[PDB]
């Protein structure tokens, strides 16, 4: 930290969201100042989970599964060949959790 560490990087690389009990939708996130420019972020469809009869069960909850990912941010702005490594939080999908009803 408190010292810039610059490295070289070669950029030339060599539908359950519908059937889930905690379903979700992917929303397009586009940023021209970022690599990857397009990131698909998941948003839970409901607060509850789908039960065996196809209805929303409010005794269980859909919660987003969030992961930290690396992205490249243009530095300076609009630079095609210089970036800063940035860590952002993204929603990958949703899982169904039971609320804590204990002690």
């Amino acid at each position, epitope marked *: 930290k408190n010292f810039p560490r610059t490295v070289m990087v070669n950029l030339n690389i060599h539908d359950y969201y519908n059937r889930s009990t905690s379903p979700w939708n992917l929303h397009r996130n586009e940023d021209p100042e970022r690599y990857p420019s397009v990131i698909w*972020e998941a948003k839970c469809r409901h*607060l509850g989970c789908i039960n065996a009869d196809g209805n929303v069960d*409010y005794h269980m*909850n859909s919660v987003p599964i969030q992961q930290e990912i690396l992205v490249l941010r243009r530095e300076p702005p609009h630079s095609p060949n210089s970036f800063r490594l940035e860590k952002i*939080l993204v929603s990958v999908g949703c899982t169904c959790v039971t*609320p804590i009803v204990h002690h």
Partner: antibody
Amino acid sequence: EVQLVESGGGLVQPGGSLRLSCAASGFTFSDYNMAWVRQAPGKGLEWVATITYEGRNTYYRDSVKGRFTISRDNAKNSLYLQMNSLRAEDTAVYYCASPPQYYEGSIYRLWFAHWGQGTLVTVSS
Amino acid sequence: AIQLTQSPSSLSASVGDRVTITCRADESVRTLMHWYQQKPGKAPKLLIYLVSNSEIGVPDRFSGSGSGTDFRLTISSLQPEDFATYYCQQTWSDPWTFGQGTKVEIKR
């Protein structure tokens, strides 16, 4: 980061009118329902009004119905609260609150995951 | 319409103590119960959503539990910065209501 910034709070004579504004940033404002929550000096939180993502539906606390109007300008990313016929019960800090970005904005029963700084409205002669 | 009652209205605890605040609803809210922390002269901050889920950035010492009419917010080990008023909120039915708040003070 999500940011909500309020303006418009001030001294207003009883029976008068005041307009609160909330500038939003850091999220797709037009995708979410927005609300105003107030707190009387030394008292608890009290929901005031809710407006849907594209302003087609509005909901109000019984005590403010007919006196307050919640509106939004999705193009300017801002929320408004037009307050008329102001009474002593309306002296409070007013907050604009937004729902969580990782849930679909079509879910009405979402909580307030982001709040503005608050703007003080003082109803006094 | 749905009334929420918090207990106690205020409490004082030493650093390291386990603090418990209850919230009781007069009708069931199922899992649509949330907790907020409000520090003096600051806006409320969301702590817990949907009974037990902490938002990212909320310390592990805060946990929520409950179901239907009885809910609880626990601070496993109280820290000096936990001085604040905590509010529960139900979003199950209109109008959305809040508890009266619980003021948490530090014994030192």
